[PDB]
Amino acid sequence: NIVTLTRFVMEQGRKARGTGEMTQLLNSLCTAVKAISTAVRKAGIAHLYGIAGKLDVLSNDLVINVLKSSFATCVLVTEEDKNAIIVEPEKRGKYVVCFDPLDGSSNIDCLVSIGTIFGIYRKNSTDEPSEKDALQPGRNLVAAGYALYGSATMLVLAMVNGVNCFMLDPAIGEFILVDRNVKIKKKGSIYSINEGYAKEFDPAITEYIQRKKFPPDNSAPYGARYVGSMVADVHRTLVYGGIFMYPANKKSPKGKLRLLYECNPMAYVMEKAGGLATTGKEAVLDIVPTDIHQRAPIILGSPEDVTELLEIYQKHA
Amino acid sequence: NIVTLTRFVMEQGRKARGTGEMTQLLNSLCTAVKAISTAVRKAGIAHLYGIAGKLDVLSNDLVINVLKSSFATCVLVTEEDKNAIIVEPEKRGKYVVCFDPLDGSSNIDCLVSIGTIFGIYRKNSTDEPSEKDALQPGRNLVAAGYALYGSATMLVLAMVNGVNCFMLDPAIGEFILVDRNVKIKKKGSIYSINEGYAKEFDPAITEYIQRKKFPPDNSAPYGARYVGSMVADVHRTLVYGGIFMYPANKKSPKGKLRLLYECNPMAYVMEKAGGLATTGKEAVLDIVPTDIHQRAPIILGSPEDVTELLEIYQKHA
Amino acid sequence: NIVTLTRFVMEQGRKARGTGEMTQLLNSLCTAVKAISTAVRKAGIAHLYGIAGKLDVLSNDLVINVLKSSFATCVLVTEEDKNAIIVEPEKRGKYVVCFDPLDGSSNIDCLVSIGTIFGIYRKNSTDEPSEKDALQPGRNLVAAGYALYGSATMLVLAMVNGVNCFMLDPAIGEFILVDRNVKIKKKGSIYSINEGYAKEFDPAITEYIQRKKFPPDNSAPYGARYVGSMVADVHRTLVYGGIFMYPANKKSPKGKLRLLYECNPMAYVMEKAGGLATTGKEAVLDIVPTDIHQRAPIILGSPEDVTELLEIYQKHA
Amino acid sequence: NIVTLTRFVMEQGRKARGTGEMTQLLNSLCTAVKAISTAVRKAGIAHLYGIAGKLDVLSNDLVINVLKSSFATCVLVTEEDKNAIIVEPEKRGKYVVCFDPLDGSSNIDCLVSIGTIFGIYRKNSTDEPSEKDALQPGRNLVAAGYALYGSATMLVLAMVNGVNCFMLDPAIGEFILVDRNVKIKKKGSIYSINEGYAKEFDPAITEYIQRKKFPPDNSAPYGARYVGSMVADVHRTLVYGGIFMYPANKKSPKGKLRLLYECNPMAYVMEKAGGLATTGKEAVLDIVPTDIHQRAPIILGSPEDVTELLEIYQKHA
Ligand SMILES: Nc1ncnc2c1ncn2[C@@H]1O[C@H](COP(=O)(O)O)[C@@H](O)[C@H]1O
Ligand SMILES: Nc1ncnc2c1ncn2[C@@H]1O[C@H](COP(=O)(O)O)[C@@H](O)[C@H]1O
Ligand SMILES: Nc1ncnc2c1ncn2[C@@H]1O[C@H](COP(=O)(O)O)[C@@H](O)[C@H]1O
Ligand SMILES: Nc1ncnc2c1ncn2[C@@H]1O[C@H](COP(=O)(O)O)[C@@H](O)[C@H]1O
Ligand SMILES: O=P(O)(O)OC[C@@H]1O[C@H](COP(=O)(O)O)[C@@H](O)[C@@H]1O
Ligand SMILES: O=P(O)(O)OC[C@@H]1O[C@H](COP(=O)(O)O)[C@@H](O)[C@@H]1O
Ligand SMILES: O=P(O)(O)OC[C@@H]1O[C@H](COP(=O)(O)O)[C@@H](O)[C@@H]1O
Ligand SMILES: O=P(O)(O)OC[C@@H]1O[C@H](COP(=O)(O)O)[C@@H](O)[C@@H]1O
Numbered sequence A, B, C, D: 001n002i003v004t005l006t007r008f009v010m011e012q013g014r015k016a017r018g019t020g021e022m023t024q025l026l027n028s029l030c031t032a033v034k035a036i037s038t039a040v041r042k043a044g045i046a047h048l049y050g051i052a053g054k055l056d057v058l059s060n061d062l063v064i065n066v067l068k069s070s071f072a073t074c075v076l077v078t079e080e081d082k083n084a085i086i087v088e089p090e091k092r093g094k095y096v097v098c099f100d101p102l103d104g105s106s107n108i109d110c111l112v113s114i115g116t117i118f119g120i121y122r123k124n125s126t127d128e129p130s131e132k133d134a135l136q137p138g139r140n141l142v143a144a145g146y147a148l149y150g151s152a153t154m155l156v157l158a159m160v161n162g163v164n165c166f167m168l169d170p171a172i173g174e175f176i177l178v179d180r181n182v183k184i185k186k187k188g189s190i191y192s193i194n195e196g197y198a199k200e201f202d203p204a205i206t207e208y209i210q211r212k213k214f215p216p217d218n219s220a221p222y223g224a225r226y227v228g229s230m231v232a233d234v235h236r237t238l239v240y241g242g243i244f245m246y247p248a249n250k251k252s253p254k255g256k257l258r259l260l261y262e263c264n265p266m267a268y269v270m271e272k273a274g275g276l277a278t279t280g281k282e283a284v285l286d287i288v289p290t291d292i293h294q295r296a297p298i299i300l301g302s303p304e305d306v307t308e309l310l311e312i313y314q315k316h317a
C-alpha cells in the first residue's frame, strides 16, 4: 500500500506526540514546493507569449507566504533577503526556517536542474524573536532537506530517524515515498568540483584530485560530474555515492556556499544518511554562525572518500 | 501573436511547397516528445506504487509507433535497436529518421536532465529501403534537433533556414517559439569534458585544458561544467557559449558518442547556429558513415574556442 | 492568505483535540478524490488508443485501498459491493465510511457531471465490527460531503460546525477553500425532478409541480433543471437554491436513491446549510436503516420550497 | 495507430488539396479550445486566492486572438460582441467564423457542463469584408462543431464527410479520435425541454410532451433530461438519441437561441449525423439570416422523434 508525504508526516507527528504545529509547517512546505515545481516547469508560459486575454522572486514570495500562513514559524531566513524576517505575533509559531527558495538560478536560462533548500530550527531563547534565533549550529536542526526540479521533482526530507525520498506525481499533486531510510554508499567513484579554479586550490585539494585521475594503485580513475547546481550535484552524491566539493579559493576565501541555508541542510542530510560533511578542518554542523549570510567551505559525500581527503588535509598541517 | 510549433511547422511547409509529408512527420515528432516528457516527469507513478491496489524502452516504443503512424518514413534507426527498422510498405514514406529516444538514461535514477535526439534524411535512391539509406553523411540532413527534459521541457529544431527554440507549456500541451534564429556566441567561458579520463587524453586536449585553467596571457580561467548528459551539456553550450568535448580514450579510440543519432544532429544544430563541430581532424558532418552504430569523437561549441583547440591539434600534427 | 483543505482539516482536528485518526481519514479521502478526478478527466487515454509501448471499478478500488491505508476505518459500505467490507484488524480504525465511488455512471458516455458521495460514522457498539455498525441513522453522522467532477472539480465537506466548499487547482493538486460556512437561500426558483414519470407520481407531487408551472398568484413559474446526476443536481440546489426531488414511483416504490451513501450524506449536507431533507412523511436523517442497500424517497433544498411541498403532502393525508 | 486531431485535420487538408489555410484555422481552434478547457477546470486558481501574496471574457479574447493569429479569417462574429470583428488586412484570410466562446456561462457558478460552439463559412463575394459576409444560411457552412467541458473535454467536428469525436488527453494536450463518422439513433427515449415554460408553450409542443409522459399506445414514457447548457443537452442527444427543444415563448416569440453561433452549428452537426433540426416550420439550415444576433426556435435530435413532433405541428396547421 502507498505512502504519501501527507500521511507519513502526520504519522510521524503522531508517534512524536506533537501538538501538530510542526506537522502544519511541513504540510505548508510541501504545498509551496509543488507550486514552485509548477512554475519552474513553465505551466502557463503561453500567457506571457500573448495567447491574449522573476522565477526566484515568485519562489521567494511563495515560500514566505505559505510558511507564514502555517502559523508555525516566528523567524524566516531567505537567501533572497538581507535581514531575517520576523513573523507578526498573530501568526507566530515556535519554528525558525532557513531556506534558499531557488538555488542555481543562474542555470535557469539553460534549463539545468534547480532546487529548494530548507533547514528548520526550534526557537530556543524565548526572548522577542529575532535574527539571533537563526544563529544556531546545524547540529541543532529539527528537520532539513530539499526539493530537486530535475527530470522529475523530488523532495528529500531528513529528520532524526533517517532520510526519506518522495517523488512528485504531478497528475494528482502528491508526493509518494519511493526510497525509505536512505543510506549513502561507503565509497563512491565520482568526484564533483569545478576544476576551473585549479589555479586557486589549496594543496590538499590538488593532491586529492590528481589521486582521482591517476590512482597510485593503477585502479580505475573516478568519473567526474559537475552540474553547477548544488542540489543536483548533492542529490547525485547521496543516491549514487562519491564526493562533492566547494572548497575555499581566492574569489571566495571562505567558500561560496552559505552555511544556514545551503551547507547546514545538506550537511544534516548527509550525516543522517551515513555520510560526512566537513569544512576540511571541521564538521559543518558544529560551526556556530555569527552572521545569517555567512559562507563556509564544504566537502561531503561517501565516508571513505571524505575521510581520504581529510587525511590529506591533516598531512599538510 | 504567439507562435506554436504546429503553426510554425505548417507555415514552413507552405513556404517550401511541400506535399505535407514532412509536416506530418514533424507533427508526429512533436506528439512523441510531449508523451515522453510526461513519462519522464513521472505523471502516474502513484499507480506503480499501488494507489489502487523501462523508461528507455517506453520512449523507444513511443517514438517508433508514432513515427510509423505518420506515413512519412521508410527507415528508422534507434540507439536501442541492433538492426535498423524497415517500415511496412503500407505506411512507407520517403524519410529516414535516426534517433536516441532517451539519452543519458543512466542518469535517470539521479533525476539528472535527459533528452531525445533526432536527425532526418530524405531517402536518396530508388530501390527497396534498407540500412544503407541511413548511411548518409550528416551534411545531407533535412532536419535535426532535440528535446531536453530539464527544469522545463524544450524542443530545439534546426533546418536549412536556421535554429529555433520552442518551450513546452505543459498546461495546454503546446510548444511555444521562444527563441528565433539562434546564434551561438563567438567565444564562451565554460569548457565541458569528463576530466576523469585525464590519464587517457591525447596531448592536444591536455594542453587545451591546461590553457583554460592557467591562461598563458593572464586572462580569467574558464569555468567548468559537465552534467554528464549530452543534450544537457550541448544545450548549455548553444545558449551560453563555450565548448563541449568527448574525444577519444581507452573508452574506444573511436570515441563514445554515436555518429548517426548523437553527433550528427548536434553537429548540425551547432553549424546552423554558427558554431563548429569537429573530431579534431575533420568536420563531423562530412564523415561518411559506414555502420549505423558507428561512434566518433566530437568537439563542438563556440567557433573561436573550437578553432583554438584545432590549432593545438595542428601544433601536434 | 490562502486556506488549503489539508490545512483546514488539520486545524479543525487540532481545535477538536482529536488523536489525529479522523484527520488521517479525511486526508486519505482527499487523495482518493484527486485520483478519481484525474481518471475522470481522461489523462492517459492516449495509452488505451495505442500511442504504443471500468471508471467505476477503478474508482471503487481507489477509495477502498486509500481508505484502508489510512488505518482509521473498520467497516466500509460501497454502492458497488453487495456486503459491507470489514477491514483487517492490523489496519482497523474506529470509523465506518459509507460511499458511492462514482455516482451517475450511466452519464459517463455522455460526459455529464458525475461525483463521489461519502458519509462517515464512528463505530459505536464495540463488538467485532460488522455490517450492523453501518446501520445507523444519518443524524449520527460525524462528517459527510461529496466531490463533483463538473466543469471544475469541487469537494463539499459538511461537519457539525457548517458546510465548506473547496475547489481543486489541478496545477498543484490542492483544494482551496472558496466558500466558507455555506447557507442555502430560504426560497429558490428552480425545481428539479424527472417529469418522465409523471404518470406514476402520487397526488401531492402532481399538485406541487403544477403550482410551479402555473402559479395561482400569477408570479414567475419556476425554471426547471434535471441533469440526471444527483451530485450535480444537489450541488446546484445548495449553491443557487430550489428543490430537488426523487419521490417514490411504481418502478421504485421506495425511491431509487440509497439511504446510506446517497440520501443521508446529502441530507446531512442540506441540514447544516439550513435546508430541509424529507421523505415526504419524515426527515431522512431520522430513519434507522435495516439493510445497507436500502432505498428511500427524498426531497431536499430551500426550506420554504420543501415546507410548501410538505404542506401539500399533509393536505392529502 | 492512434489518430490525433492534428494528424486528421492535415490528412483531410491533403485529400481535399487545400492551400493549407483552412488547416491552419482548424489547428488554431484546437489550440484555443485546449486553452479554454484549462481555465474552465481552474488550473491556477490558487493564485487568485493569494498563494503567493471574467471566464466569458477570457474565453472570448483567447478565441479572437488565436483566430486572428491564424491568418485564415476576415470576419469574426461572437455572441459577446455587439458588432462583428473585421480582421486587419495584414492577417486577413478568407474565412468567416461565428462562435459562442463559452455557452452556458450562467451555469459556471454551479460547475455545470459548459462549452464552445463554432461555425465556419468561406467568404462569398469579392468586396471589402463586413458583417454581411456572415449573413449566410447554415447550409453554406464549410465546417461546424463544438467543444464540451464536462466530466472530460470533447471536440466534435462536423464537415461535409461526416461527424467525428475527439477526446482531449490533458496529460499530453492532444485530441484523440474516439468516435468516427457518428450517426444518431433513428429514435431515442429521452426528451429535453425546460418544462418551466409550460404555461407558454404552443399547442403542438404541449401535445407532444403529453404523448411522451402518457403514451397513447401504451408504450413506455420517455425519460426527461435538461441540463440547462445547450452543448451538454445537444451532445447527450447526439450520443444517446432523443430530442432537444427550445421553442418560442414569452422569452421572445422568436426563441432564445441565436441562429449564427448556436443553432446553425448544432443543426449542421445533427444533419451530418443523420438527424433533423427544425424550427417547427422550416429547417434551421435554410433560414436566411438577416441579423448577426438573430434568434430562432429549434428542435433537434433523432429523425423519428423530430418527424413525430413535426406531424403534430401540422395537425395544428
Ligand atoms: N510530523 C512530525 N514529524 C516528526 N517529528 C515531529 C512531527 N511533529 C512534531 N514532531 C516532534 O515533536 C516536537 C514538537 O512538535 P510540535 O508540538 O508540533 O511543535 C518537534 O519539534 C519534533 O521534535
Ligand atoms: N514543414 C516543413 N518545413 C520546412 N521544410 C519543409 C516542410 N515540409 C516540406 N519541406 C521541405 O520540402 C521538402 C519536401 O516536403 P515533402 O513533400 O513534405 O516531402 C522537404 O524535404 C523539405 O526540404
Ligand atoms: N480534522 C477534524 N475535523 C473535525 N473534527 C475532528 C477532526 N479530528 C477529530 N475530530 C473530532 O474528534 C473526534 C475524535 O477524533 P479522533 O481521535 O481523531 O478519532 C471525531 O470523531 C470528531 O468528532
Ligand atoms: N483540413 C481540411 N479538412 C477538410 N477540408 C479542407 C481542409 N483544408 C481545406 N479543405 C477544403 O478545401 C477548401 C479550401 O482549403 P483552403 O485552401 O485551405 O482554403 C476548404 O474550404 C474545404 O472545403
Ligand atoms: O545561483 P546560486 O543560488 O547562487 O547557486 C549557485 C551555487 O553555485 C555553485 C556553483 O558555483 P560555481 O560556478 O562557482 O562553480 C552551486 O554548487 C550553487 O548551486
Ligand atoms: O549512452 P547513454 O547511456 O545514453 O549515455 C549518454 C552519454 O554519456 C556521455 C557521458 O559519458 P561519460 O560518463 O563517459 O562522461 C554523455 O555525454 C552522453 O549523454
Ligand atoms: O448511475 P447511478 O449511480 O445509479 O446514479 C443514477 C442516479 O439516478 C438518478 C436519476 O435517475 P433517473 O434516470 O430515474 O431520473 C440520479 O439522480 C442518481 O445520480
Ligand atoms: O446565453 P447563455 O448564458 O450562454 O445561456 C445558454 C443557453 O441557455 C439555455 C437555457 O435557457 P433556459 O433557462 O431558458 O432553459 C441553454 O440551452 C443555452 O446553453
Ligand SMILES: [Mn+2]
Pocket: A056, A079, A080, A100, A101, A102, A103, A104, A105
Ligand atoms: Mn535563491
Ligand SMILES: [Mn+2]
Pocket: A079, A100, A102, A103, A104, A262
Ligand atoms: Mn543558492
Ligand SMILES: [Mn+2]
Pocket: B056, B079, B080, B100, B101, B102, B103, B104, B105
Ligand atoms: Mn538511449
Ligand SMILES: [Mn+2]
Pocket: B079, B100, B102, B103, B104, B262
Ligand atoms: Mn545515448
Ligand SMILES: [Mn+2]
Pocket: C056, C079, C080, C100, C101, C102, C103, C104, C105
Ligand atoms: Mn457508483
Ligand SMILES: [Mn+2]
Pocket: C079, C100, C102, C103, C104, C262
Ligand atoms: Mn449512485
Ligand SMILES: [Mn+2]
Pocket: D056, D079, D080, D100, D101, D102, D103, D104, D105
Ligand atoms: Mn457566451
Ligand SMILES: [Mn+2]
Pocket: D079, D100, D102, D103, D104, D262
Ligand atoms: Mn450562448
